[PDB]
Amino acid sequence: LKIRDAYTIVTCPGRNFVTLKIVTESGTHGIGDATLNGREMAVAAYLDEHVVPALIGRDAGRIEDTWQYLYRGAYWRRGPVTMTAIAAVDMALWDIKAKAAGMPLYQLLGGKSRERVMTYAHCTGQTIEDCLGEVARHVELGYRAVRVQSGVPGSSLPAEHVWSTEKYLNHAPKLFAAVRERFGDDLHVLHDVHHRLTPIEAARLGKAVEPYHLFWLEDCVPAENQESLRLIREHTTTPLAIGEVFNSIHDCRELIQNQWIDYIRMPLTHGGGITAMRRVADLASLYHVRTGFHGPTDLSPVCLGAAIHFDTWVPNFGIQEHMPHTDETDAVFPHDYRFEDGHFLAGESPGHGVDIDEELAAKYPYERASLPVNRLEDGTLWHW
Amino acid sequence: LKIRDAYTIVTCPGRNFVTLKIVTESGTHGIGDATLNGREMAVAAYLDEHVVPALIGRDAGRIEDTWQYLYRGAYWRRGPVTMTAIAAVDMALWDIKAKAAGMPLYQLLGGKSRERVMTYAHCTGQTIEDCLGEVARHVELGYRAVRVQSGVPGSLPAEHVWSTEKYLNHAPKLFAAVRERFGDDLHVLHDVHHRLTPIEAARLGKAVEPYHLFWLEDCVPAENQESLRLIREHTTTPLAIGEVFNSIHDCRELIQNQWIDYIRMPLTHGGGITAMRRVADLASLYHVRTGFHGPTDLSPVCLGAAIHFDTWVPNFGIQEHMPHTDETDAVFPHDYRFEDGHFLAGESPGHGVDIDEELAAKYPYERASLPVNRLEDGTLWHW
Ligand SMILES: O=C(O)[C@@H](O)[C@@H](O)[C@H](O)[C@H](O)CO
Ligand SMILES: O=C(O)C(=O)C[C@H](O)[C@H](O)CO
Ligand SMILES: [Mg+2]
Ligand SMILES: [Mg+2]
């Protein structure tokens, strides 16, 4: 069946989301996430002006061909705006194919490899003790894994934050010691360094936290130069994760083949969708690397539902990040995935099982909001 | 001085161009090219909605800090849309800085390294003979270098058909004909435009060694930079690549492994003067030279700034010249000049290019997409 209509929907049920909707001649439809936090309108224009007009009249079943058409056809390849636009189309086309097959997406991908998908929760506090308070509450909600972040002693436009690496390095290990001290060894404990270290600094950190056996240490260093991971991997056995800022397998091919990471974090909506992420997960499986999908509030329930289906099938699944969306967001994107006892259960409806309530989405107009920047104490513009 | 205003202009004097204008508290101003062929409105929105609002009140003199601020601050790094928006800001701030300095941009960059900048022309035809005719006409205009292209016998994107095997059998005849009629002094360039696999490109490279090409360009899609290894190991025909790149990270290994001789990434797509300085610096360590992509889909703002960069940069190789329409030239009054096959950098402060906002408004945006290639079985291929 041919594509009859395609259009984007922009909404701000607590924060901005951009969604692509594709409708066939038969009335069947599918949606895909197109949200790129803090650059949302770039993807909206990429879709409205350059992609959507070319979708009309295309065979909706030709997912692979459409992917190549958009990826190669763009001439300028890869990039967050580019691959997010591509992801959105791809996710809507998988949604449609699954519906057409009368199957939940996980069935179409190869069937279920697990009964539930483990998540991790965000436990953040101004201080260690505040963070420990949050770990306690999330464990009570059933989470078996937690990401711990604490303040270090000492917005429409980007907020400006200040950073000290050495203050962070001397404080971080205390957080993890305190977590283990209180909650014991069974809990999976994750930590996101969020790009702020150099490789030898991350190496030191990795070593220092070895006694606390972290599930992962995430985004140690900016990795446009993938070789950046080498010194870290050679100096510590703390497991490493990276990739939420990646959009292409070509951003992480060397990382994976060299066994420099344990978990690949690139999610569906920024990594070119289901089609592209199958290939990434495939390469990963050759090197013992597992999926650890980025799952913040700035990827919509559409991506989350798709991700949960993907997580249900993919053999080398690692973990699924869970930052719950607001009530309002959840109402704008009705879905059949469910959270129970610290795990997700995939939906059983045909498609990825997520919809968009267009009338409700219309009640929340877009509101500009930018990610923060980080500066060192001398004013140097650093990595946030 | 602080930035007082910043805004984009979208105009279509023969084809689409996007331009960023930055204006300081004193009325001084600079422009930067922001044109991304076939995806123009993505860049326009990136700038209009997300970058411009943050530019206001910023110190215009802080070029480096602004570059890092937009590059790192974006969070999602690199990419065609991303690095073009950044290139436009960068180019406009260097315009402004050179203006404040009372110097043409090349002086600000380190002074002139050469007295003129060699260009190459496009010589395209349906048949080899058509091509030779175009070569002759450009040689008479003073061009010492031509990029030769002939046909292979046998609003939305046009869809072309492609056959590698027919091309591989035909292309060597074009270069042999070119040498036969024009001899050995002329530099002869060829752009394979992404259509080959590495071992195919290696075959082609070897086939054309007798004709001593200035370069063989974009042999293979190079997202995987290792793609170049087989070609380099099997032929001594020089290799150029990079018009589709936007980051030093797209080409670091290619350069460090000496897999190419010319880096093609241009100012507007490669993060501007600031980023391209670093690319040129890395290239010089490995005897790689600059060969800026210079099609009509980069505006005269880019061309003027490129000519300046070309004038200073020690490891300059060549500058591509596809002449813009007279209408384009009128929208972007400029002081670089073409003489006898070479550019001369302008001598006015800044990069020497302006935009006529009243004329630009006479040419509204019109959507136009690049072609796609399909093989004969309908496989969606590389264009
Ligand atoms: O792992 C994470 O959840 C963070 O790195 C993200 O919340 C990130 O800061 C934002 O998603 C960026 O949009
Ligand atoms: O001039 C060249 O070398 C080209 O390959 C031109 C490109 O196809 C064109 O600029 C794409 O916008
Ligand atoms: Mg993170
Ligand atoms: Mg080319």
Sheet strands side by side (includes A160-163): A160-163, A373-376, A381-382
Chain A CB contacts of B80 under 8 Å are 74, 76-79, 81-82
3-state DSSP assignment of residue B138: helix
Task: Name the pairing type of β-strands A343-345 and A373-376.
Answer: unpaired
Q: Which of the ligands is closest to the CA of residue B268?
A: 2
DSSP A367: -
Orientation of helix A80-101 relative to helix A63-73, angle to 10°:
170
Alpha carbon distances (Å) from B151 to B154, B211, B220, B281, B333: 9, 19, 19, 38, 35
Residue whose C-alpha is closest to residue B188's, from B244, B150, B233: B150
A369 interfaces chain B, CB cutoff of 8 Å: no
3-state DSSP assignment of residue A165: helix
Neighbours of B376 (CB within 10 A): 13
Orientation of helix B164-182 relative to helix B198-207, angle to 10°:
20
How far does the CA of residue A247 sit from the closest CA of chain B (Å)?
Answer: 9
From the list B50, B170, B190, B193, the catalytic residue is: B193
Cβ-based burial of B160 (10 A; exposed 0-12, middle 13-18, buried ≥19): exposed
User: Which runs of E-coded beta strand occur in A193-346?
Assistant: 216-218, 240-242, 263-264, 290-291, 320-321, 338-340, 343-345
Residues B143, B186: Cα–Cα separation, whole Å: 9
Half-sphere exposure for A124 (CA within 13 Å, toward CB): 5
Do residues B213 and B361 both lie within one domain?
no
Q: Token pair 């289901």 is at which residue?
A: A274
Q: Are B50 and A38 in contact (CB under 8 A)?
A: yes
Task: Name the pairing type of β-strands A29-33 and A17-24.
Answer: antiparallel
User: CB–CB of B77 and A50 under 8 A?
Assistant: no
CATH of the domain at A196: 3.20.20.120
In a mutational test of the B interface, the residue from A41, A77, A382 whose CB has the highest number of chain B CBs within 10 Å is: A77
Do residues A85 and A208 both lie within one domain?
no
Pocket test for ligand 1, best of A298, A325, A373 (most atoms within 8 A of CB): A298
Do residues A83 and A109 both lie within one domain?
no
Do residues A90 and A226 both lie within one domain?
no
Do residues B312 and B174 both lie within one domain?
yes
The token duo for A322 is 């869970």
Sheet strands side by side (includes B17-24): B3-11, B17-24, B29-33
A222 interfaces chain B, CB cutoff of 8 Å: yes
- Ligand 2 contacts (CB < 6 A) are A 75; B 37, 191, 193, 243, 293, 295, 297, 320, 370
Neighbours of B199 (CB within 10 A): 12
Maximum Cα interatomic distance, chain B, rounded to a whole number of Å = 62
How far does the CA of residue A17 sit from the closest CA of chain B (Å)?
Answer: 15
Mention every residue, 6+ apart, whose C-beta is less than 8 A from residue B18. B8, B9, B10, B33, B34, B35, B36, B40, B43, B44, B47, B88
Residues A119, A142: Cα–Cα separation, whole Å: 10
Q: Token pair 């315009």 is at which residue?
A: B95
Neighbours of B80 (CB within 10 A): 25
Structural element, H or E, at residue B253:
helix B252-256
What is the residue type of A167?
K
Cβ-based burial of B209 (10 A; exposed 0-12, middle 13-18, buried ≥19): exposed
Do residues B326 and B355 both lie within one domain?
no
Residues A39, B82: Cα–Cα separation, whole Å: 10
Do residues A384 and A317 both lie within one domain?
no
Do residues B1 and B146 both lie within one domain?
no
3-state DSSP assignment of residue B29: strand
- Give the residue, by CA position, lying nearest to ligand 1 atom 3: A296
User: CB–CB of B82 and A79 under 8 A?
Assistant: yes
Residue whose C-alpha is closest to residue A303's, from A277, A271, A336, A268: A268
Sheet strands side by side (includes A3-11): A3-11, A17-24, A29-33
Across the interface, which of A73, A77, A383 has its CB nearest the CB of B72?
Answer: A383
B28 Cα distance to chain centroid = 27
A293 Cα distance to chain centroid = 5
Do residues B38 and B119 both lie within one domain?
no
Do residues B335 and B356 both lie within one domain?
no
Residue whose C-alpha is closest to residue A289's, from A347, A243, A354: A243
Structural element, H or E, at residue A371:
none
How many domains, chain B?
Answer: 2
Residue whose C-alpha is closest to residue A298's, from A268, A330, A325: A325
For residue A95 and ligand 1, the question of a CB distance below 6 A is answered with no
Phi-psi domain of A46 (left: phi exceeds 0; alpha: psi -120 through 50; beta: other):
alpha
For the CA of A37, the nearest atom of ligand 1: 13
Half-sphere exposure for A9 (CA within 13 Å, toward CB): 26
Residues A71, B380: Cα–Cα separation, whole Å: 10
3-state DSSP assignment of residue A210: helix
Mention every residue, 6+ apart, whose C-beta is less than 8 A from residue A365. A11, A12
Q: Are B49 and B65 in contact (CB under 8 A)?
A: no
Q: Which of the ligands is closest to the CA of residue B298?
A: 2
Structural element, H or E, at residue B21:
strand B17-24
Chain B CB contacts of A381 under 8 Å are 65, 68-69, 72-73
Residues A304, A311: Cα–Cα separation, whole Å: 10
Chain B CB contacts of A78 under 8 Å are 78-80, 223
Residues A189, A210: Cα–Cα separation, whole Å: 12
Neighbours of B221 (CB within 10 A): 15
Q: What are phi and psi of A156, to 5 degrees?
A: -65, -45
For residue A296 and ligand 1, the question of a CB distance below 6 A is answered with yes
Residues A351, A307: Cα–Cα separation, whole Å: 12
Residue whose C-alpha is closest to residue A232's, from A256, A210, A204: A204
Residues A308, A88: Cα–Cα separation, whole Å: 16
Q: Where are the alpha helices (DSSP H) in A20-79?
A: 40-45, 52-55, 63-73
Q: What are phi and psi of B118, to 5 degrees?
A: -65, 140
Residue-wise burial string across B279-302, b where 16 or more C-beta atoms lie within 10 A, e elsewhere? bbeebeeeebbbbbbbbbbbbbbb
CATH of the domain at A60: 3.30.390.10
Q: What are phi and psi of B21, to 5 degrees?
A: -115, 130
Residues B122, B217: Cα–Cα separation, whole Å: 13
Residues B290, B273: Cα–Cα separation, whole Å: 13
Q: Are B216 and B208 in contact (CB under 8 A)?
A: yes
Resolution in A: 1.8
In the residue annotation, B193 being an active-site residue is answered as: yes
From the list A29, A171, A188, A194, the catalytic residue is: A194
Across the interface, which of A39, A44, A74 has its CB nearest the CB of B74?
Answer: A39
Across the interface, which of A50, A68, A81 has its CB nearest the CB of B46?
Answer: A81
The token duo for A332 is 């704008």
Neighbours of A164 (CB within 10 A): 15
* Interfacial B residues in 234-293 facing A (CB < 8 Å): 244, 246-247, 249, 252, 269
The token duo for A246 is 């990646």
Do residues A245 and A120 both lie within one domain?
yes
* Interfacial A residues in 290-309 facing B (CB < 8 Å): none
Q: Identify the closest residue of chain B to A194 by CA–CA distance.
A: B75
Which experimental approach was used here?
X-ray
Residues A8, A79: Cα–Cα separation, whole Å: 20
Structural element, H or E, at residue A132:
helix A128-140
User: CB–CB of B39 and A74 under 8 A?
Assistant: yes
How far does the CA of residue A275 sit from the closest CA of chain B (Å)?
Answer: 16
Task: Name the pairing type of β-strands A117-125 and B239-241.
Answer: unpaired
How far does the CA of residue B142 sit from the closest CA of chain A (Å)?
Answer: 32
Chain A CB contacts of B369 under 8 Å are 50, 54
Containing structural domain, residue A47 = 1-104+349-384
3-state DSSP assignment of residue B263: strand
Do residues B96 and B126 both lie within one domain?
no
Residue whose C-alpha is closest to residue B71's, from B251, B205, B271, B259: B271
